[PDB]
mmCIF file of N, CA, C and O in Angstrom:
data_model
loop_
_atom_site.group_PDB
_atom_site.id
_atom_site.type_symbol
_atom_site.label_atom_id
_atom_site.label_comp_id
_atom_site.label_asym_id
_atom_site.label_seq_id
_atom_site.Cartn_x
_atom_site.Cartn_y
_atom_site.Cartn_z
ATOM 1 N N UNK A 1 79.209 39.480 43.306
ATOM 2 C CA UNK A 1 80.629 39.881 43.471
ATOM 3 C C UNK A 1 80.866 40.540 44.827
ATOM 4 O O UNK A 1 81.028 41.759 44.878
ATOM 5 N N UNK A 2 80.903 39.574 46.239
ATOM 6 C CA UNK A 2 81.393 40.558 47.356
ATOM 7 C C UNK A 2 82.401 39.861 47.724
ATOM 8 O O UNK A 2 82.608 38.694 47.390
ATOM 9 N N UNK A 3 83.423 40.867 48.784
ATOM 10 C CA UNK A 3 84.659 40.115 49.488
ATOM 11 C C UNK A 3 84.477 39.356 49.834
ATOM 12 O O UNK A 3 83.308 38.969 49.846
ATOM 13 N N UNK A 4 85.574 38.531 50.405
ATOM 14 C CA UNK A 4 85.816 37.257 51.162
ATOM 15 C C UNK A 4 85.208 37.414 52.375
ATOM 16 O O UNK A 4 85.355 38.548 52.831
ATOM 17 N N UNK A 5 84.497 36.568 53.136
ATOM 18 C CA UNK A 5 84.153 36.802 54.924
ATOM 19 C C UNK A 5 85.556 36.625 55.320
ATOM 20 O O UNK A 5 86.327 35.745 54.938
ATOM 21 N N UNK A 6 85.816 37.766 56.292
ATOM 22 C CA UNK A 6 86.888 38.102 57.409
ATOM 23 C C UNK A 6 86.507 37.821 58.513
ATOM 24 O O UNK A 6 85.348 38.117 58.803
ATOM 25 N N UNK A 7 87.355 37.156 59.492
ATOM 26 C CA UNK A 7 86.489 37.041 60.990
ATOM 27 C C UNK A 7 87.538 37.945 61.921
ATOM 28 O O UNK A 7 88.421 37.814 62.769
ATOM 29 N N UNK A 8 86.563 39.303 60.900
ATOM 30 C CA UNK A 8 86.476 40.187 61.702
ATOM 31 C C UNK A 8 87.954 40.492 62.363
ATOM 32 O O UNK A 8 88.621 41.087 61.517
ATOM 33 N N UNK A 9 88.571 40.327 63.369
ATOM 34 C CA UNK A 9 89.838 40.180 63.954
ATOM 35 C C UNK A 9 90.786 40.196 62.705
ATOM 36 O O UNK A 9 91.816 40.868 62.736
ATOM 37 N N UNK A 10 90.436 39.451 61.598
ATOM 38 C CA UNK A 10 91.303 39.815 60.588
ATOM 39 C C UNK A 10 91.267 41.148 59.790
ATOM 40 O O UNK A 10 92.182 41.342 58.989
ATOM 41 N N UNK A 11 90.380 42.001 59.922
ATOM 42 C CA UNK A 11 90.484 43.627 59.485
ATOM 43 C C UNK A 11 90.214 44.219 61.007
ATOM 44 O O UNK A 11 90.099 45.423 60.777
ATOM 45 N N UNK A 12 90.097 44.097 62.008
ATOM 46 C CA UNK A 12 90.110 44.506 63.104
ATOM 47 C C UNK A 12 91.636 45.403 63.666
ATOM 48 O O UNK A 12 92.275 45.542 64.709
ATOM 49 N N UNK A 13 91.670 45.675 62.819
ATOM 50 C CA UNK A 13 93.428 46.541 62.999
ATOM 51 C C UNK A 13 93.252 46.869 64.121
ATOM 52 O O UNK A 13 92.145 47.299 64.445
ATOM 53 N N UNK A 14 94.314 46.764 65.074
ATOM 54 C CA UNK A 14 93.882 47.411 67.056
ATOM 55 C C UNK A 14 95.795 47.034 67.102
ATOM 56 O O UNK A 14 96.365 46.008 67.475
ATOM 57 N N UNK A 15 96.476 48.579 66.457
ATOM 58 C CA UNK A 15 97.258 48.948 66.574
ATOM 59 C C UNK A 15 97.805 49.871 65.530
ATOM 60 O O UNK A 15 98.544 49.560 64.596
ATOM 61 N N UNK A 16 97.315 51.094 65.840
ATOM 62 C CA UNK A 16 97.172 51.861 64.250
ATOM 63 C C UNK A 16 98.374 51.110 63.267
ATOM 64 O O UNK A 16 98.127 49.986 62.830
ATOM 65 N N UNK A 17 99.815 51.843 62.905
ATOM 66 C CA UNK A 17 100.660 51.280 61.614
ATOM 67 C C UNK A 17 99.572 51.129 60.284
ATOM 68 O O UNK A 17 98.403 50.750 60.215
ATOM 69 N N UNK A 18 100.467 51.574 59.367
ATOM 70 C CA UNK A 18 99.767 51.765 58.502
ATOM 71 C C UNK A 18 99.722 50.504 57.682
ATOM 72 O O UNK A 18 100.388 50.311 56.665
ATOM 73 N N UNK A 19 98.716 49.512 58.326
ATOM 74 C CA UNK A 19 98.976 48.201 57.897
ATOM 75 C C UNK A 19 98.000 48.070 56.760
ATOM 76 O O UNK A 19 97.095 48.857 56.481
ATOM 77 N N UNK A 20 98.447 46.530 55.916
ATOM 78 C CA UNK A 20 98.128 46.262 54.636
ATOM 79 C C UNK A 20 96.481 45.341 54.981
ATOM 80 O O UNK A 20 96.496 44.281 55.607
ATOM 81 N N UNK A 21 95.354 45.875 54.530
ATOM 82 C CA UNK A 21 94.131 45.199 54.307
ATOM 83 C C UNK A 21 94.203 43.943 53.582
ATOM 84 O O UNK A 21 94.874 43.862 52.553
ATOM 85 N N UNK A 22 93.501 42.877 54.093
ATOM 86 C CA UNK A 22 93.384 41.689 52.720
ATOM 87 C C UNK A 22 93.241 41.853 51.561
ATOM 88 O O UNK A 22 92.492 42.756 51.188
ATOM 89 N N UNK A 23 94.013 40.913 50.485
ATOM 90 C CA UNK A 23 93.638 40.835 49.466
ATOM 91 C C UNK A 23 92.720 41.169 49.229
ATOM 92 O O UNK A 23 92.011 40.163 49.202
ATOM 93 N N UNK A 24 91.747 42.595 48.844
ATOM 94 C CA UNK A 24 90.283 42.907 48.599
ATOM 95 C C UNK A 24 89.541 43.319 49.432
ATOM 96 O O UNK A 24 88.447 42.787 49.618
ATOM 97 N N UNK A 25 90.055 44.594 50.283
ATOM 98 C CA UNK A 25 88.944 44.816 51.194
ATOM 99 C C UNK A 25 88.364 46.209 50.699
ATOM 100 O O UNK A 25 88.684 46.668 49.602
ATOM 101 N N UNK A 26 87.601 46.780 51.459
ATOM 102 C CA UNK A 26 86.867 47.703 51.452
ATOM 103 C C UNK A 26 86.322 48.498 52.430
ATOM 104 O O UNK A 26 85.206 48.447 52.948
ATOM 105 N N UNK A 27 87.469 49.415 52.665
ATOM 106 C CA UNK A 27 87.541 50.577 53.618
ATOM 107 C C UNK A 27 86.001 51.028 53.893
ATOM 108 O O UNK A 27 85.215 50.363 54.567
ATOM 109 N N UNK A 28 85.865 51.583 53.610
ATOM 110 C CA UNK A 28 83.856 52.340 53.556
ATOM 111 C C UNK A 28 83.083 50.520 53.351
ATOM 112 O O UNK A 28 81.879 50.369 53.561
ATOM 113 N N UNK A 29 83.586 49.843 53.118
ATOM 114 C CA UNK A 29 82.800 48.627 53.085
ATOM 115 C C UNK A 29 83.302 47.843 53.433
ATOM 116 O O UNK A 29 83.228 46.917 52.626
ATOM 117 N N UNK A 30 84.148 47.482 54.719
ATOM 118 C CA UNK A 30 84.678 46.262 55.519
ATOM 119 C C UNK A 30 83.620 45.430 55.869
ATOM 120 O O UNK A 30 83.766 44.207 55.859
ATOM 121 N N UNK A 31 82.590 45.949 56.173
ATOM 122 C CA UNK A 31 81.577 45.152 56.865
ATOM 123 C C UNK A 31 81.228 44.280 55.548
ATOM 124 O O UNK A 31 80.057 43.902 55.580
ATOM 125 N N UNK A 32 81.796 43.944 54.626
ATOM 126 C CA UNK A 32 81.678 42.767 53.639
ATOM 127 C C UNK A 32 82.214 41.875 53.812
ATOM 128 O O UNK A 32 82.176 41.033 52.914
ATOM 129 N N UNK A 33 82.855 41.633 54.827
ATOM 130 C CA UNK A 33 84.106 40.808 55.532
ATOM 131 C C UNK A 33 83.863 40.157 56.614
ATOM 132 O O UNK A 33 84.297 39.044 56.912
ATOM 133 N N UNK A 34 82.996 41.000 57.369
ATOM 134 C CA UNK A 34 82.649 40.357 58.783
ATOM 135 C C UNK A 34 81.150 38.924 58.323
ATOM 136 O O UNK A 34 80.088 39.027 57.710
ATOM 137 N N UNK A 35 81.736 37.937 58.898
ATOM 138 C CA UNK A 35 80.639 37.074 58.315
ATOM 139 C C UNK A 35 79.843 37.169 59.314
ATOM 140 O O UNK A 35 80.013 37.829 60.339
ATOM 141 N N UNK A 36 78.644 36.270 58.922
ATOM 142 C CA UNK A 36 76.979 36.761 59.706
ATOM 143 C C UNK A 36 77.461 36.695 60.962
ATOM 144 O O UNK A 36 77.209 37.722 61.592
ATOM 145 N N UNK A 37 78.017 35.937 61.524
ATOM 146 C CA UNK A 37 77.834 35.066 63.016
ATOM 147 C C UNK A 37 78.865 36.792 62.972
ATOM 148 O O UNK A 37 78.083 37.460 63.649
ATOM 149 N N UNK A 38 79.841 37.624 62.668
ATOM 150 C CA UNK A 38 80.456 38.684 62.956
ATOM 151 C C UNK A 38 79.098 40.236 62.839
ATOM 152 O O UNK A 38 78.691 41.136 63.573
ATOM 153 N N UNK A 39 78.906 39.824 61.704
ATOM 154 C CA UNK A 39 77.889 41.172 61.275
ATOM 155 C C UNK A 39 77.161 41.108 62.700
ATOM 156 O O UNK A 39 77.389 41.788 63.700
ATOM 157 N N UNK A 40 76.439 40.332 62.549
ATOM 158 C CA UNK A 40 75.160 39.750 64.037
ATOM 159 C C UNK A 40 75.164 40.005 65.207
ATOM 160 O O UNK A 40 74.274 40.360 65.980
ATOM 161 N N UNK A 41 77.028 39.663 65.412
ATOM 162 C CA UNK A 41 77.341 39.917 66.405
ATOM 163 C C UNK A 41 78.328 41.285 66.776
ATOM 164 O O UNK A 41 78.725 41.531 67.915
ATOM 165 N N UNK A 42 78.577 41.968 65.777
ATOM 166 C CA UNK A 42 79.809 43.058 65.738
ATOM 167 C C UNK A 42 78.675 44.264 65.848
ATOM 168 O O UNK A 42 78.771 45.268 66.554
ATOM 169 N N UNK A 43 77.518 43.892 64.924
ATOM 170 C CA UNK A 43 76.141 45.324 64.874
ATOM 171 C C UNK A 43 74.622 44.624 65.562
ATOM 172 O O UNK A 43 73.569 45.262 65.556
ATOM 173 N N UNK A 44 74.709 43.647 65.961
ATOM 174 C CA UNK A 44 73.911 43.334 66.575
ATOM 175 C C UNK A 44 72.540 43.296 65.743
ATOM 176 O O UNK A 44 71.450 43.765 66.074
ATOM 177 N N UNK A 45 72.943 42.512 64.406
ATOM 178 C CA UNK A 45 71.574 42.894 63.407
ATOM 179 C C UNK A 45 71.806 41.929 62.169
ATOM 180 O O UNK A 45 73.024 41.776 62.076
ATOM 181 N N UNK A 46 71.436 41.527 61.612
ATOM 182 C CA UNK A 46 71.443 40.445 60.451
ATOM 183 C C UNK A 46 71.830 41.033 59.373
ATOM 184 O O UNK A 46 71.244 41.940 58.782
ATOM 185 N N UNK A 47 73.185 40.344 58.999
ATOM 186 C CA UNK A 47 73.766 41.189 57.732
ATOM 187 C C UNK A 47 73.121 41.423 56.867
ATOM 188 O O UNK A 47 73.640 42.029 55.929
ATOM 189 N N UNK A 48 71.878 41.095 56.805
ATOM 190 C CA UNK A 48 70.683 41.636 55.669
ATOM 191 C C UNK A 48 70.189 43.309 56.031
ATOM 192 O O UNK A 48 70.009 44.267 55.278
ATOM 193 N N UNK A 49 70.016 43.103 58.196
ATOM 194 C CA UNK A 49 69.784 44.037 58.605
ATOM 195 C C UNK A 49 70.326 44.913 57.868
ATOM 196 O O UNK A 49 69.610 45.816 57.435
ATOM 197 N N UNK A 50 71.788 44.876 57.521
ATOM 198 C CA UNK A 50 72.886 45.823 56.615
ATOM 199 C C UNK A 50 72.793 45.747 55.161
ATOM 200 O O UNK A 50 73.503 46.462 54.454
ATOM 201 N N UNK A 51 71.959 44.922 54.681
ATOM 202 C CA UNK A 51 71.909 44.917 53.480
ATOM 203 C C UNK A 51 70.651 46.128 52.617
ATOM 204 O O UNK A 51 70.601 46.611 51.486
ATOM 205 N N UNK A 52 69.775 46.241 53.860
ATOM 206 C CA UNK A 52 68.682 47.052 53.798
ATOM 207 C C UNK A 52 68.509 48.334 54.082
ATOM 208 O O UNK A 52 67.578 49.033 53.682
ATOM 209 N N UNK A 53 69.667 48.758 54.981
ATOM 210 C CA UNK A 53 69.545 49.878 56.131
ATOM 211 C C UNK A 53 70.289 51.333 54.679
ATOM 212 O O UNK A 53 70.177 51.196 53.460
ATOM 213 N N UNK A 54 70.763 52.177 55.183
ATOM 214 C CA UNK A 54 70.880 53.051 54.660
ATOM 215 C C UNK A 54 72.518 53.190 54.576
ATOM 216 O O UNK A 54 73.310 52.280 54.826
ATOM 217 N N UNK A 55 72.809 54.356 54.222
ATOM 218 C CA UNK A 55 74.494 54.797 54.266
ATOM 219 C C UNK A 55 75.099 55.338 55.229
ATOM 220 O O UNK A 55 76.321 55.324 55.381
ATOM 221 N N UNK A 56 73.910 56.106 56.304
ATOM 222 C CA UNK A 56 74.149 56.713 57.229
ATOM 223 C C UNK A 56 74.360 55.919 58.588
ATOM 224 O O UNK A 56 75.187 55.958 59.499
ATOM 225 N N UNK A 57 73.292 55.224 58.312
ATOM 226 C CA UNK A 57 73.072 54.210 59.747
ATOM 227 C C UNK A 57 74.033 52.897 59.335
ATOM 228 O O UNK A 57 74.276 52.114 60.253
ATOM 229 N N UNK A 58 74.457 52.678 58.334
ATOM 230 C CA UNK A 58 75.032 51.843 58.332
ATOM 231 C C UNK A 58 76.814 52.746 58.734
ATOM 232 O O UNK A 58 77.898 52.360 59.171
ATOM 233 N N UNK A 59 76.240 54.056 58.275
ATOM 234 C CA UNK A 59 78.078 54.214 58.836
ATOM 235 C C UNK A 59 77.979 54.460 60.183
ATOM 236 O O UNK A 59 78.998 54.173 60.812
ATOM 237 N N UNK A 60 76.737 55.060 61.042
ATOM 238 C CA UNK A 60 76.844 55.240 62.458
ATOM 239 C C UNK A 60 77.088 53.722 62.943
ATOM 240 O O UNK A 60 77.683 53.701 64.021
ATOM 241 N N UNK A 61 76.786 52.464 62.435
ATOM 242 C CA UNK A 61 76.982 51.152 62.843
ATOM 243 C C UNK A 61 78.218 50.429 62.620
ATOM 244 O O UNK A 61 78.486 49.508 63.392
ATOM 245 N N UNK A 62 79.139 50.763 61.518
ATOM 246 C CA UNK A 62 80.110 50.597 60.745
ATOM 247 C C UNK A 62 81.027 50.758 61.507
ATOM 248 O O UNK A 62 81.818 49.819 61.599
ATOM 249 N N UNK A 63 81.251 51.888 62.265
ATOM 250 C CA UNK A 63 82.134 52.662 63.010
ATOM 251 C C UNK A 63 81.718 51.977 64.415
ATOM 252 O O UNK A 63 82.532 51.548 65.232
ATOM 253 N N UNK A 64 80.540 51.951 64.533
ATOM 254 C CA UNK A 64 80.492 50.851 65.976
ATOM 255 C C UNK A 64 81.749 49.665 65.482
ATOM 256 O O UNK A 64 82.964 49.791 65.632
ATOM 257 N N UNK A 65 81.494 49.271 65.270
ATOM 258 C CA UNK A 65 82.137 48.374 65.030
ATOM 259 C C UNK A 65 84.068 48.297 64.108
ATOM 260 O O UNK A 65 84.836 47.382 63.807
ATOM 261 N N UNK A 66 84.082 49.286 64.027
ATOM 262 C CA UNK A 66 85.414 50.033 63.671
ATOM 263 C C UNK A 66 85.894 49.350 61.879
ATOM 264 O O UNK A 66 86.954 49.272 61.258
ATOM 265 N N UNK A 67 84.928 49.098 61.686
ATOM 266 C CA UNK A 67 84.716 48.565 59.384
ATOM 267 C C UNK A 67 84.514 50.155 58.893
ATOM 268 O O UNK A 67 83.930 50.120 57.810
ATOM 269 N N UNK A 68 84.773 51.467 59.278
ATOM 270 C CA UNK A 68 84.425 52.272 58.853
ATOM 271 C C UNK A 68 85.928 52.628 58.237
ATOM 272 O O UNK A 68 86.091 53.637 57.550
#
């Protein structure tokens, strides 16, 4: 059961407004959205990399990438 892949640009909000997330996203867990070729390339690590890593490093990475 995970979200839809987003490419990215589609939760990439880059104009605050308090705009509406896709059907099903996940604030603390956007990065469920970014598909591999995004994860890979948004954290520089294999969305498994993220599947493995922790809560912390995944939020210091998360926020790289602005899915936080």
């Amino acid at each position: 059961p995970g979200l839809q892949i987003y490419p990215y640009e589609m939760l990439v909000v880059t104009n605050k407004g308090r705009t509406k997330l896709p059907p099903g996203v996940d604030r603390m867990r956007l990065e469920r959205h970014l598909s591999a070729e995004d994860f890979s390339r948004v954290f520089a690590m294999s969305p498994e990399e993220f599947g493995k890593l922790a809560l912390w490093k995944r939020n210091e990475l998360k926020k790289k990438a602005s899915l936080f």
